[PDB]
Amino acid sequence: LAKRIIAALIVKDGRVVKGSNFENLRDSGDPVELGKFYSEIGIDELSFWDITASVEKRKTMLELVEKVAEQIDIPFTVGGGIHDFETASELILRGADKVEINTAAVENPSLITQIAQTFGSQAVVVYIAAKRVDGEFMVFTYSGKKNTGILLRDWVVEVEKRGAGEIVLGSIDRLGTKSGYDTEMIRFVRPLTTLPIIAHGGAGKMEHFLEAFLAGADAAKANSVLHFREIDVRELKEYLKKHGVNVRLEHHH
């Protein structure tokens, strides 16, 4: 239960969408070189979310995990339109440690069980995008476009029951705002599940990570605050360790 800092990269056609400000890199838009650099400066895990056009997407995501696996040694997750078991299977076999699923899991919760029955619960990360509606936390699918009418409280319990290994708790209310993590939502979800909770949405400064870990998150997912170097990963882990947060600062056949 060392808290984990996870760098999330949005990719498309093998490119980091909107790149990064790491001028030391030969290609600041290369997801492989950027992920490698993050792994060398103390990021605990990587997460790739692909938005490639559907006709090149399958081959594009497979090339990605193959190139990432050969270069990095820390765990990484791949996600973005993973709709069924066979797609998840080929991605894990080709190099990914874990797959991240949202819409397809909501529409068919047995998909969680199906992947976990071959690859283990530890390979199945369920992203839950939630938002306050009429005083209740609701589950949203299709990139935030559809209110499922399903309560966050009910979906969290079902997700663990179906055999998921971890939950990314994404607050639509906070996505892109730099205003902080939705600690009220994290605190709401924490007593409902024994699974690791990965906070996503709202990161803006180092103090937001402290607040998220106080609220009960086991990991924090960060995107542009890292790529645009508004927060430094090394400074962040120094800060969290300084204030009591257990973070890490240091082959089968």
CATH number at residue 104: 3.20.20.70
Structural domain containing residue 70:
1-253
Distance CA 114, CA 193 (A): 20
Contact present, 65 and 94 (Cβ < 8 Å)? yes
Neighbours of 76 (CB within 10 A): 23
Domain total in the chain: 1
Distance CA 234, CA 42 (A): 7
Nearest to 5 by CA among 242, 237, 243: 237
Contact present, 14 and 230 (Cβ < 8 Å)? no
Distance CA 115, CA 57 (A): 20
